[PDB]
Amino acid sequence: ISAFQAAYIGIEVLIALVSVPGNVLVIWAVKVNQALRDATFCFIVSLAVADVAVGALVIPLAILINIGPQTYFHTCLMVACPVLILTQSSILALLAIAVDRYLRVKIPLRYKMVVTPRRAAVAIAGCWILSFVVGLTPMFGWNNLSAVERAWAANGSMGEPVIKCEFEKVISMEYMVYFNFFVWVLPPLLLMVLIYLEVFYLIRKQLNKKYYGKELKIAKSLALILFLFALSWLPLHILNCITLFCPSCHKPSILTYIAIFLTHGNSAMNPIVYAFRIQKFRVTFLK
Amino acid sequence: LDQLRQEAEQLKNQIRDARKACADATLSQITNNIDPVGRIQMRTRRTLRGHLAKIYAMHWGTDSRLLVSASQDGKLIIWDSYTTNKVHAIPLRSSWVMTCAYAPSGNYVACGGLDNICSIYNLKTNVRVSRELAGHTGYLSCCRFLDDNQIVTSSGDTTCALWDIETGQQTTTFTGHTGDVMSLSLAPDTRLFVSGACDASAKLWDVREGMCRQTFTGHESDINAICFFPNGNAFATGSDDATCRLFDLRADQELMTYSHDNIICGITSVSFSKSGRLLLAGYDDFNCNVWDALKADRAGVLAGHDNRVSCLGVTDDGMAVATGSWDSFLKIWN
Amino acid sequence: AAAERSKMIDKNLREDGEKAAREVKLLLLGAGESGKNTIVKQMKGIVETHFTFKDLHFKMFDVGAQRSERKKWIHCFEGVTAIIFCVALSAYDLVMNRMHASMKLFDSICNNKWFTDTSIILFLNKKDLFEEKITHSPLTICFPEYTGANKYDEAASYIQSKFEDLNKRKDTKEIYTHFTCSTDTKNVQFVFDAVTDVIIKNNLKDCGLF
Amino acid sequence: SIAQARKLVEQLKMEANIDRIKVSKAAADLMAYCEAHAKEDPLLTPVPASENPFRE
Numbered sequence: 068i069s070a071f072q073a074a075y076i077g078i079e080v081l082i083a084l085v086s087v088p089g090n091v092l093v094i095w096a097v098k099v100n101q102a103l104r105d106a107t108f109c110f111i112v113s114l115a116v117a118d119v120a121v122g123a124l125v126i127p128l129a130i131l132i133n134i135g136p137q138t139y140f141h142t143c144l145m146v147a148c149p150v151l152i153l154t155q156s157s158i159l160a161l162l163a164i165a166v167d168r169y170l171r172v173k174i175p176l177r178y179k180m181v182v183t184p185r186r187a188a189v190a191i192a193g194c195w196i197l198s199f200v201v202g203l204t205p206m207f208g209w210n211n212l213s214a215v216e217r218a219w220a221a222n223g224s225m226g227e228p229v230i231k232c233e234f235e236k237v238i239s240m241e242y243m244v245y246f247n248f249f250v251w252v253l254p255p256l257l258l259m260v261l262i263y264l265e266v267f268y269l270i271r272k273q274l275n276k277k278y279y280g281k282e283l284k285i286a287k288s289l290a291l292i293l294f295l296f297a298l299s300w301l302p303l304h305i306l307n308c309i310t311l312f313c314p315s316c317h318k319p320s321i322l323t324y325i326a327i328f329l330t331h332g333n334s335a336m337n338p339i340v341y342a343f344r345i346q347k348f349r350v351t352f353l354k
Numbered sequence: 355l356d357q358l359r360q361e362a363e364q365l366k367n368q369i370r371d372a373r374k375a376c377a378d379a380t381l382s383q384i385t386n387n388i389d390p391v392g393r394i395q396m397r398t399r400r401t402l403r404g405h406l407a408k409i410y411a412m413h414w415g416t417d418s419r420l421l422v423s424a425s426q427d428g429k430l431i432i433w434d435s436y437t438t439n440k441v442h443a444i445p446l447r448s449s450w451v452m453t454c455a456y457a458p459s460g461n462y463v464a465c466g467g468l469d470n471i472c473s474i475y476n477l478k479t480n481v482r483v484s485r486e487l488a489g490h491t492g493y494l495s496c497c498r499f500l501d502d503n504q505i506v507t508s509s510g511d512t513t514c515a516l517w518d519i520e521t522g523q524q525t526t527t528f529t530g531h532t533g534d535v536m537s538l539s540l541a542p543d544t545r546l547f548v549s550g551a552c553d554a555s556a557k558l559w560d561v562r563e564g565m566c567r568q569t570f571t572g573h574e575s576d577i578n579a580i581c582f583f584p585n586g587n588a589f590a591t592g593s594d595d596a597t598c599r600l601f602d603l604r605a606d607q608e609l610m611t612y613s614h615d616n617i618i619c620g621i622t623s624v625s626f627s628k629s630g631r632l633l634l635a636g637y638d639d640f641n642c643n644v645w646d647a648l649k650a651d652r653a654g655v656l657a658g659h660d661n662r663v664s665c666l667g668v669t670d671d672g673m674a675v676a677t678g679s680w681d682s683f684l685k686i687w688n
Numbered sequence: 689a690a691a692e693r694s695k696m697i698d699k700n701l702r703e704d705g706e707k708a709a710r711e712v713k714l715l716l717l718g719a720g721e722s723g724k725n726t727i728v729k730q731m732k733g734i735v736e737t738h739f740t741f742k743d744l745h746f747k748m749f750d751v752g753a754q755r756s757e758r759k760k761w762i763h764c765f766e767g768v769t770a771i772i773f774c775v776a777l778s779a780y781d782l783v784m785n786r787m788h789a790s791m792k793l794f795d796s797i798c799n800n801k802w803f804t805d806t807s808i809i810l811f812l813n814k815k816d817l818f819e820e821k822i823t824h825s826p827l828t829i830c831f832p833e834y835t836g837a838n839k840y841d842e843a844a845s846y847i848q849s850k851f852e853d854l855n856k857r858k859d860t861k862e863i864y865t866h867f868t869c870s871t872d873t874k875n876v877q878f879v880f881d882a883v884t885d886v887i888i889k890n891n892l893k894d895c896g897l898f
Numbered sequence: 899s900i901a902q903a904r905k906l907v908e909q910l911k912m913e914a915n916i917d918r919i920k921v922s923k924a925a926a927d928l929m930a931y932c933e934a935h936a937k938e939d940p941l942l943t944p945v946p947a948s949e950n951p952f953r954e
């Protein structure tokens with residue numbers, strides 16, 4: 068329908084087709100083995116079902132929204148809001164892993180008795196209910212229902228509005244910048260870097276108390292984790308920001324597209340970086 | 355001293371000749387004519403969950419419904435296998451147990467291991483220790499009830515012993531093994547038993563005279579498991595050399611070997627089905643292989659565990675096989 | 689009901705199964721006459737010793753009493769947190785040598801199929817009895833290939849290097865060597881520090897960081 | 899050392915004098931047991947679902 072749009076679709080299709088098999092393989096290897104039923108694998112399969120849902124539902128929904136089929140307004144809210152719910156759940160699952168990996172080094176002796184797998188499930192369920200609220204906030208009245216009905220009435224029609232549905236048309240940008248980014252994406256990013264900087268001190272302190280190579284490998288593992296999260300979510304959110312605060316700031320179209328697939332791309336890199344590094348997890352996949 | 359021992363070796367030469375003399379045929383060619391059974395597909399009907407460490411032994415009750423299991427978490431659990439209900443969970447004084455047994459009356463269980471003590475527990479008093487049979491100088495590796503009154507035990511100290519539970523004394527000792535005894539099996543008529551040891555020999559013992567009538571060699575390494583054929587005139591052994599062998603009492607020699615080139619791991623447990631046709635054996639490769647005992651072809655595999663099958667047993671009525679494993683689960687199959 | 693009995697018993701299993709899962713289990717292995725007894729005096733068939741130090745319950749199993757073959761019961765201790773190995777330094781000349789017999793025993797437990805991932809706490813004993821007796825006899829009786837000054841500092845560090853370098857699994861298990869002291873606090877404190885380091889490194893291997 | 903060792907020989911003497919049966923008779927008895935009890939073996943010849951206690 069357009070050269071740039073067609074390119075974006077193909078990238079999305081392959082992101083989906085690499086996000087759904089790897090993540091179900093994480094869920095498969097968790098369910099077939101019984102040595103992966105402790106506290107930290109609960110958080111990992113929570114991340115896994117979040118990211119496979121991305122590759123399952125978010126990617127087709129995102130492709131459909133981009134193509135813009137003409138749709139009634141309340142119908143487009145129930146299409147656009149599952150993109151918000153599922154992607155947010157990925158972010159909060161990532162945050163939950165980091166708190167788990169922080170407790171392994173802050174309280175290592177009484178770790179097993181404090182974060183018991185029963186308490187893991189309440190925190191996982193807590194992440195998901197917070198994911199659903201942030202996603203369903205547009206349907207509760209924080210949307211462009213106000214702005215669209217003025218434009219509809221001007222050309223003369225009446226009833227319920229029918230628009231070429233695009234994400235910037237039904238979801239207001241003061242929601243995305245002030246509530247999605249500044250409350251529910253930016254504090255999770257900053258809590259991760261504070262948790263992981265603190266983790267690196269405690270790990271380094273123990274090692275000092277042949278060792279330089281392990282310390283640099285641990286720092287390389289932590290850096291890669293933080294950079295991939297900060298490379299995914301940050302560009303798309305900044306583009307939303309400079310669309311709100313600078314309304315006349317013109318930016319190209321394929322820039323906006325390229326940001327979106329990076330956000331989806333995180334759901335593909337999650338099993339490679341998180342589960343494929345664990346030795347117990349890797350060996351039941353190889354065998 | 356040397357010439358006297360070779361004189362015993364001179365006796366060994368005629369014994370080999372005498373055993374060869376009566377090998378008029380092979381079991382394989384005698385049983386060549388029958389149709390083979392073909393693939394047998396037992397599915398797991400129950401998973402018994404609740405142990406929190408490796409399971410080392412199990413034993414069916416004679417009612418074919420209750421079973422007892424022993425694990426390194428210090429718990430002896432009696433399961434109602436039909437409903438998956440736990441009937442009793444007995445807390446063990448020492449958690450390093452290696453064997454358990456169910457009394458035929460159902461009133462008693464026995465258990466022991468690296469503590470060198472065989473503890474007898476009265477189930478029909480909650481469950482309390484009724485006797486601690488002391489006297490072995492190695493780990494207790496196996497124990498079996500002749501009846502409520504009497505229990506035969508085997509030990510790493512190279513002896514087996516028959517105990518009178520009421521008085522707590524060894525009534526007869528069975529010496530003659532030259533390595534730690536790993537397993538024993540009571541004859542159906544309970545007047546004889548066989549023992550398996552790490553000297554690669556099995557020995558048939560007479561309970562009332564208390565000495566070894568016959569010794570069966572042929573294995574090249576440790577015998578971990580042993581089980582009578584259901585008519586009591588033959589038995590099968592399981593060894594670390596990845597083979598099982600069937601030995602006949604009256605023919606006093608090996609009759610059949612059960613092995614594949616593609617199985618190289620040790621055998622941990624063996625049992626016959628009710629009719630004797632199937633010999634089921636548990637392997638270090640996490641699987642149980644089902645052999646046709648008459649024709650030595652492998653009939654099937656039971657692959658449902660993530661660690662060694664350490665114990666198994668077939669019900670008295672023949673209806674089911676239970677397998678217990680180091681991965682902390684028991685499964686019931688038929 | 690019968691399922692009520694099943695559920696009540698299952699509750700006691702989960703209760704007692706976590707109460708006994710917060711206790712560090714330490715297999716204690718040594719040679720005959722190697723000085724195992726002095727370590728157990730400080731801290732208070734198979735013999736189980738239970739002591740609590742700094743809110744950590746330690747179960748230490750002295751299994752040296754068993755005269756049976758090791759290969760038949762060593763898989764029962766696959767889940768022990770660490771292995772405490774006691775070596776008598778004074779026994780480098782006594783009796784085919786006693787120190788050579790202990791090095792072959794050490795090389796069996798360290799390169800075992802079950803103990804690939806289990807760290808070894810190594811205790812060298814009688815460093816005072818070793819320090820005085822080292823001048824009347826060289827280490828060439830025990831270790832011929834030794835080319836060092838015959839003083840306690842150099843000799844002890846060579847014996848520790850011989851015992852350590854028998855670790856072929858240099859990446860996954862670590863040998864912590866401490867020369868035992870007569871004061872009770874120091875030896876138990878080292879055991880707690882070694883157990884703390886192995887527990888932290890076990891947690892790190894489950895993240896994927898280590 | 900000889901006197902303690904010699905006692906094994908009398909056991910070997912006991913094993914030496916027993917009568918052994920030919921494999922042809924011995925093996926025939928085992929197959930005869932298996933064929934006669936084929937109908938009482940639920941693992942050899944599988945039972946219907948309803949009769950089976952574990953999964954009726």
Ligand SMILES: Nc1ncnc2c1ncn2[C@@H]1O[C@H](CO)[C@@H](O)[C@H]1O
Binds near residue numbers: 155303307330331
């Ligand atoms: N400006 C935007 N245009 C289109 N989709 C957007 C925009 N901002 C965020 N999204 C969507 O929101 C999700 C993140 O909450 C992303 O998966 C992305 O598809």
